[PDB]
Amino acid sequence: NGKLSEHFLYLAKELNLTGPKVPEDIYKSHLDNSKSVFSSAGLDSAQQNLASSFVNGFLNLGYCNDKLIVDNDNWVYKTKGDGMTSAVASIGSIYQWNLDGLQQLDKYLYVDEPEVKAGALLGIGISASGVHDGEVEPALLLLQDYVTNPDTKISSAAILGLGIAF
Amino acid sequence: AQLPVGFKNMGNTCYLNATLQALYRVNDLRDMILNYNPSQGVSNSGAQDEEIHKQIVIEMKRCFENLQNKSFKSVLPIVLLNTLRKCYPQFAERDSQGGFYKQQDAEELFTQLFHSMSIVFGDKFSEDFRIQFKTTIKDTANDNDITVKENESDSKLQCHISGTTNFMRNGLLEGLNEKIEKRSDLTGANSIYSVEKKISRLPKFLTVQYVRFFWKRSTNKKSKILRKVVFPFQLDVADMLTPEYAAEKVKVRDELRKVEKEKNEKEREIKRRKFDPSSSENVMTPREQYETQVALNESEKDQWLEEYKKHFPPNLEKGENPSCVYNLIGVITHQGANSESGHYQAFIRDELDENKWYKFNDDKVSVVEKEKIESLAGGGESDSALILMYKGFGL
Numbered sequence: 001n002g003k004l005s006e007h008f009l010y011l012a013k014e015l016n017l018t019g020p021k022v023p024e025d026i027y028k029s030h031l032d033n034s035k036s037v038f039s040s041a042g043l044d045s046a047q048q049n050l051a052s053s054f055v056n057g058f059l060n061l062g063y064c065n066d067k068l069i070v071d072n073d074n075w076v077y078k079t080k081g082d083g084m085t086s087a088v089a090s091i092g093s094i095y096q097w098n099l100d101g102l103q104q105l106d107k108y109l110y111v112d113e114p115e116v117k118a119g120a121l122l123g124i125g126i127s128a129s130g131v132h133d134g135e136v137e138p139a140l141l142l143l144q145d146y147v148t149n150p151d152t153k154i155s156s157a158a159i160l161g162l163g164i165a166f
Numbered sequence: 167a168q169l170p171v172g173f174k175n176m177g178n179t180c181y182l183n184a185t186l187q188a189l190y191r192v193n194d195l196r197d198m199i200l201n202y203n204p205s206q207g208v209s210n211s212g213a214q215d216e217e218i219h220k221q222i223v224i225e226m227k228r229c230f231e232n233l234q235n236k237s238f239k240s241v242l243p244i245v246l247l248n249t250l251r252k253c254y255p256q257f258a259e260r261d262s263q264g265g266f267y268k269q270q271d272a273e274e275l276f277t278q279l280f281h282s283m284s285i286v287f288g289d290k291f292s293e294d295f296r297i298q299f300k301t302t303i304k305d306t307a308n309d310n311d312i313t314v315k316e317n318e319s320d321s322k323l324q325c326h327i328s329g330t331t332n333f334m335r336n337g338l339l340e341g342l343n344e345k346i347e348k349r350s351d352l353t354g355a356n357s358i359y360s361v362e363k364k365i366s367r368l369p370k371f372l373t374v375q376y377v378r379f380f381w382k383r384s385t386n387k388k389s390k391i392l393r394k395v396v397f398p399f400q401l402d403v404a405d406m407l408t409p410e411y412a413a414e415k416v417k418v419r420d421e422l423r424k425v426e427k428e429k430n431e432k433e434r435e436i437k438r439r440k441f442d443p444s445s446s447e448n449v450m451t452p453r454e455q456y457e458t459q460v461a462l463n464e465s466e467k468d469q470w471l472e473e474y475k476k477h478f479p480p481n482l483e484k485g486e487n488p489s490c491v492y493n494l495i496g497v498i499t500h501q502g503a504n505s506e507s508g509h510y511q512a513f514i515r516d517e518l519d520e521n522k523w524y525k526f527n528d529d530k531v532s533v534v535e536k537e538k539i540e541s542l543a544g545g546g547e548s549d550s551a552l553i554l555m556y557k558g559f560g561l
Contacts, residue, residue, distance in 0.1 A: 044444065
């Protein structure tokens with residue numbers, strides 16, 4: 001980009017296509033075929049109560065609709081401990097490789113526990129990977145503010161996040 | 167209730183262990199023992215060893231409470247044994263390590279224990295083991311002479327397995343044909359008598375003692391009758407019962423059948439719950455749900471037993487079995503012909519599942535089946551019954 005942008009046959013299409021924005025778009029077409037699932041696996045009670053939540057994430061690799069499962073705040077607050085952190089990050093993994101599904105994560109970022117704030121930031125990292133040269137919703141916009149907050153857990157999720165997304 | 171466990175051994179007390187677990191598993195017997203306090207005293211002052219007999223009973227209390235406990239495989243039989251030596255010189259006998267006691271005949275121990283409970287409780291303990299017989303005494307050569315006893319009775323029935331036998335069942339028949347001779351020829355010669363007993367009144371609890379220890383004359387050794395026997399799980403005694411007594415028993419048995427089915431109906435519904443996981447309750451092992459269910463079951467079973475007993479006619483007398491069927495609850499088996507240092511093993515039918523049995527090889531617990539006990543060939547090839555303990559159905 002700059003060679004292409006100097007010629008200016010079209011500015012936008014070339015930037016998008018050099019950038020990873022077109023790689024986000026082709027996948028959207030693909031998902032429909034492979035079939036969008038709300039499928040979860042994992043069992044209740046004890047340390048599996050933590051697992052089942054996380055596992056929904058891993059099973060919904062790449063960009064997938066699992067919007068309605070996520071929309072329940074029940075499952076998220078039902079996780080315990082440090083496991084709460086991993087839950088919010090894994091919601092980002094449902095929405096891996098794509099901006100769309102930011103909104104659910106932002107909610108966690110403001111509310112309750114220090115634990116879920118760190119989780120929200122890590123997950124926003126995982127999701128925003130589908131950009132680095134589209135420069136459409138930069139990672140930097142979200143991620144600056146939490147470096148400044150001196151709490152160690154919050155900052156750590158966030159400055160690792162920057163590393164992944166760009 | 168709570169599962170039975172290891173019974174502390176310490177060498178040469180094998181026989182002693184086996185008999186004690188055996189008595190415990192009888193439901194009635196356990197409670198009376200638990201409910202024994204020295205305040206109620208001996209119910210007979212006909213015995214100069216009245217105080218000692220109280221003391222035994224108390225040490226068995228100790229043992230029983232601890233046996234039940236899943237925690238304690240200790241029961242401390244060190245003191246109990248000491249007490250036995252004082253009470254009876256049979257048990258002071260036989261040189262050994264530490265005290266003098268060693269391995270013995272579980273048959274000897276069982277008769278002596280029996281009197282101990284009998285004196286403390288009185289006639290209540292007794293009626294629950296009294297067997298009446300209408301005994302006909304006919305000389306084989308003089309059949310014409312027939313002398314009849316109607317008030318003959320005994321606490322214990324002998325199964326003779328000497329003479330042609332292949333089964334416990336056959337041996338119960340041969341056991342009625344004891345043979346005795348009589349110096350009088352006013353009863354017709356010095357010939358053997360056929361002595362034929364029919365049981366005209368059953369006790370709640372039936373004790374079978376194998377008679378089989380003898381000195382084999384020809385080899386000049388202690389021996390025991392080597393002949394095969396096989397003991398079926400379910401016993402039926404309908405043939406030995408005099409017809410007139412038998413009819414009443416078949417009718418009673420039917421009310422009992424109904425309860426046995428409602429007991430096994432709600433039993434199945436237990437197994438399902440455990441099979442499934444615990445689902446949501448959140449950061450919990452399944453184990454905590456599960457223990458609770460195990461507790462329900464033990465309660466439900468005692469409750470079902472009480473239903474059989476309440477439903478029995480008020481015509482039924484205490485010290486009569488309701489029925490003609492009995493269920494096998496305890497097998498004291500013996501191994502080795504010598505009992506001078508033979509070894510005793512114990513099989514005890516599991517409480518929580520009657521279906522299952524625990525083999526208690528002294529302290530050491532291993533799981534076996536009810537079937538495994540049926541499949542025994544008996545004799546000396548395998549462990550073989552010396553004392554069998556039989557429990558009236560539903561008690």
